[PDB]
Symmetry: D2
Subunit: 387 residues, 4 copies
Amino acid sequence: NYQPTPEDRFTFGLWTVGWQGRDPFGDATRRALDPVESVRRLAELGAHGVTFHDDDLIPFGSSDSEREEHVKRFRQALDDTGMKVPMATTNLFTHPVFKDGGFTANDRDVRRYALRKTIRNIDLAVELGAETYVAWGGREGAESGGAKDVRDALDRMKEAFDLLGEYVTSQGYDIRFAIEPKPNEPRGDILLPTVGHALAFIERLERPELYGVNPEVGHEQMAGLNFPHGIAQALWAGKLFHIDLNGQNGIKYDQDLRFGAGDLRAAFWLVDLLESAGYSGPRHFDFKPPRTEDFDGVWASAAGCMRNYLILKERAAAFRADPEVQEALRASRLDELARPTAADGLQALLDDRSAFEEFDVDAAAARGMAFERLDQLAMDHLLGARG
Amino acid sequence: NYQPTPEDRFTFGLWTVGWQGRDPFGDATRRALDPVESVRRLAELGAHGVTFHDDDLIPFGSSDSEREEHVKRFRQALDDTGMKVPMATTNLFTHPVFKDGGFTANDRDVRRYALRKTIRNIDLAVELGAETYVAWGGREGAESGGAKDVRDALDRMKEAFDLLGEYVTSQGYDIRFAIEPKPNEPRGDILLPTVGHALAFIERLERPELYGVNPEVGHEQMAGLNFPHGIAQALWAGKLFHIDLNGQNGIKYDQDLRFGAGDLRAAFWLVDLLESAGYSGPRHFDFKPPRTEDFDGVWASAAGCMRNYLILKERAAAFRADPEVQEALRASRLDELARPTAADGLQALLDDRSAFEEFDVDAAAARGMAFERLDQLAMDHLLGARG
Amino acid sequence: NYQPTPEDRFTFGLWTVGWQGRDPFGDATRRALDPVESVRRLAELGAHGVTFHDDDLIPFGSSDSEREEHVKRFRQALDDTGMKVPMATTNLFTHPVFKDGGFTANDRDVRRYALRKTIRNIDLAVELGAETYVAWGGREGAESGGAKDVRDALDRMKEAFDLLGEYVTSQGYDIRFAIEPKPNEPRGDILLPTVGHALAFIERLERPELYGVNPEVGHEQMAGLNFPHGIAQALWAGKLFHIDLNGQNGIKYDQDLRFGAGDLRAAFWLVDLLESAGYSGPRHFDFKPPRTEDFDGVWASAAGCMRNYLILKERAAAFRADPEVQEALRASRLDELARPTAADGLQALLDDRSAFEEFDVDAAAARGMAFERLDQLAMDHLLGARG
Amino acid sequence: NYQPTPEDRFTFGLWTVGWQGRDPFGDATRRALDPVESVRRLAELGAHGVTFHDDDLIPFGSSDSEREEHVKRFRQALDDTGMKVPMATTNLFTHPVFKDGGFTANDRDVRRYALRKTIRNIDLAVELGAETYVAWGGREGAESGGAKDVRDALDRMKEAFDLLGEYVTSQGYDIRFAIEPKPNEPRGDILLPTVGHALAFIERLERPELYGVNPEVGHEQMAGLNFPHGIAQALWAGKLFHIDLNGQNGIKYDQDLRFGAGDLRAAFWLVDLLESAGYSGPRHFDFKPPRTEDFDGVWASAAGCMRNYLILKERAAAFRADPEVQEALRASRLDELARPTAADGLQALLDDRSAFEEFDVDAAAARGMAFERLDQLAMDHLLGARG
Ligand SMILES: [Ca+2]
Ligand SMILES: [Ca+2]
Ligand SMILES: [Ca+2]
Ligand SMILES: [Ca+2]
């Protein structure tokens, strides 16, 4: 069982299953995949859609007529399979010209070029029916302190995003932007390193309602942060526009393992959250099948992303519906957490002697939270051990 | 030389020099310090002022008349020395009642009590002339996923801060709030873990203009983040209300080493930033003299905080005034980073063929950034090796 | 089900269930437990035995006659319950005198005292029937570079351990030593920081056969290392004398969560390893019930340590016995990994043209490892999803 | 000043200055360098020598006669400049055939091929006068638990190294082996992850006297470990055969920054150690000029490696020769650390009542270590602030 269907909204970047396995120390282990073949193979596995960078679809430097051809063939594949394109993004990191950034390159002519390369792809994304346009600032940052005045760079980043906003507004496009944060790699430190930094920056843009976040499991974990806590803050702010799902083993290089790999418990708490909150965006996998694998291992890895999400969804649902868990949640006062501290208001609080002057602090101190009992029930549900 | 004076605005918490050296594995190595003796000793060393938690100054559970006495003696010490009190904070972490939090405890009665304990200390802080009231949510978080619904907790945290805002506004107090972020310890994961998360949360409060950040060097480093980059984002947002200075060796327990210890280069880039931006708040040291030390080592450690700031300030000033550095900054196009990408506007950009259609991408790609030359000049200035 | 019995060899330190919840920022949340009550409560839950520091059992500074009394009462409890004492250790970290170390304190008189405090407890451990005597050098290290010449310190550490060896040999005691590594906390950096450093140091002792390791899950993880890989190296060397089981969420302060918490997958791979290798030592839990909990949560947390080990053992056994997994292991060439590279010997290898001159490198390159298929089978077994 | 000469023994890999700037997300930013041009350019800057992988010097798949040609041209360059070749190594990581390892690949035919490729390069290294042959097991490890039985792999790694030993012994070559540890990247976890793990493994080889370590600054730091402490353990064991010098900012991807970048204080403590211990091997830089840089930045970056070592050497010498520092070292009892704990022997210790029964523990406890005073003197020396 645990058979995905298009209704689950599982999507994959072309660059994921298409990763040839070139890493910093080694050559490609797999041949290039034709975009058309990935769309067919992914449709068969039960995915809902694909996502793309401009350069994954249209070889860099293609003439207009080659461009048209490449798009026509891809569109035929989407029509043949029923696959959608809910998101797209720009490659502002591969070509040498972007070595010091796109939107925040020190060189003004490069920043202009980055904006133009981006706008041309927004038009194509809208034509293909994308609802979300992602920006990953992978080259925006520094290896040394004097190379990048961060205040000026944030001025340039605000400027670029406000211009993009102006463009989509003037063209009457129904697309929104999502920033994908990452703390480092390939630059020593990348600007807007976490979901929090991205959420704070968005509030200073001219039209903040057009921008949200595309957080990635492995990225927040590269800073040692709790990914479900970070997603909860994004949901609370109304800014979870998209999500990247994958696996990461702690603080090191960006692994991009299949979803469910890495920190398994954090994966369970994430699915519990997404499903309880009613998140209805795409479930996108930004992952790389390891370079050990041949083409059969590529499709197995991708199928496993989807499988692990669906097993985790069933176990989270079972945990929340268990009457014994419901009672534990009450024993730990989760119900009280949800009630206002002082709906009576500030003067009532100040006059309330049971809040301070006659508050028995030692009796309140003695009450156990019963969190460990709750957590082991959650453990037993994850592992299928409530038999 | 490098002799601090009160004009440098160096401040210290009472709990810093007063730390008795109790750690998770060992007993106190030093006897308690009387608050009056710390104010005298710090004045002699050249500090500008002190900061305090309610409980550092007034033993928990003191009667009103003991409270009055304790305050009177401390005030006499401030008058005798000329020492100021620019910041104060509440202890919402030591007493067992706060084991699941203050403002976000699951138990509503504890959340009420935390608000009342906080307000009573705001009144005292204003009486002593504090301009900034810090909140460190050290118990707000979780060790397990099911213990804390983060959305509800952020509702409770917003509620507490909005109430505090209402209180100071209604009393006509000229005080502002600053949140001190920390990613973990003593809870497994703490809410609002970084400067970015804190900045994003503040934008959802009812009166955001009353709240900013009190970032700490060692805390951001506990997440592997670049502290000067984080301070630059806070300065850009207009939210650097206060700062905690100290040292930390990478990702591990919160060390609170003396300033200049830990990551020395990040300390240089921070001072360069604070001084170039014109930061005029207090230079506060939230540090712990190591428990190896006796009282003579306590005062040496504190004096060193101040010394290292002043050596770093001289070296940063020398770096920025060096004509050879000025020319390197131009060679690396720092001047261009500061100029608008597209002050000509969006239609001009789109019509500009030198931005895309006739942009020579290979020639732009070939230009070296000259960052390594710049960085080694910065190295030579730090080390005093431009002789 | 998953009911522990004494035959499973689950042991707990007295200091684990006895932890009063004092952390660096807060007071105790639970009252002290009498050692006799912990032995009774642990026996009821199904544990095999307990472990102790000298100071957990005999209050520091007790007279000889109080000492005798304390031991007599504890022995009565062991007799009443059938509980064993397979391991013991010395507290060389709590008292202020050990602030710069025990065996590697700069002060020679303290190093002498540490050796004497240790020997007195070895005698008691043997009397109680301990087979393993653990040393955790928690104060051996430094916060600054000039404080500790590491070569000299390693001379002092070798000296202490060689003396201990001489003592047990001269008394004809059948006890061996195990070093518990930890990379940091409470010192900034601790000497012999990982299992590897400890294994290398043991080879330079005069009688290396008397010493091995007591690795802890959470400690190796505080350095970002793979704990099952580390245990495999220890097993390969014949030095896994004991093990500490618990949970840790990545690189931060030492959490000491219940076993199975933290990195769940690493917990599965560890149990798979221990059980396949035939490890027959104690399964000891060095954990701290979180300070949120009352006494009911303390016993629930301890029971969960044991439960999670037994669920993990069942899932690992099922994975290894599955014929489909056996065939996957062959598809990935695990069988070939176990066969000698060159049992034919060096001259045969050099003359073998199929090894170099006629080796088809491109055909070897093309073969997929099929690791992702294998790993998802392992995922399905862990989660109980091979239905 | 701070002008390197060949007598300082600064060496560089061909792959360092030759790095074309291809990273996991981007194409090359610099053209290939001819090995002959790097030898000339490095000689001019004051280096002593170069190091090479087989594949840096002889393009993979070259015929015997092309091989001979490539070697002849390189030898002419070494003769023309006076440059030496003190170390060499094998590329067992780039070609796709090594995707699951060399010596520990699951496939036996690949393990044979790795041994043959290695031996052919040992012959060439000896011909060029290398004294040290380095092995970096960058592909030896795993991304998932079931892919690699670590016990069997350590059997295969021991087997490979014992064969290499047998080869050099039978050929009467005066070369020794050094293992370069790294904890992860490009595999999720790499076998023998730290200096400690490598030192422990060497003690189980048949001729351990032929093998030592080549620790790298940035690698140990990728595990959060103190590099000078690790080098001290290697020196204590007599196994520091070579060293890789570079810079790294904490726990993340392997940066390979120029030496002196990254953790500056750890760089000072390392130079202090190397120079005080009389380390007389090569000072090798395993670094990558950042891909931001053109060829002028490549040579500036390399020159800076050498400059920072020489500034650090002068400051460390000044610290150790300062009579005020000498007295501080005594105040902190560094002299006592170097004296035997119990040269009187075990029975004398046990009979000595001043070691236990009459030891005044509270008076010993009260003595301050004076470490913070010492550390600030070390700070003032580093920064050139003892004027
Ligand atoms: Ca990623
Ligand atoms: Ca701190
Ligand atoms: Ca621990
Ligand atoms: Ca490296």
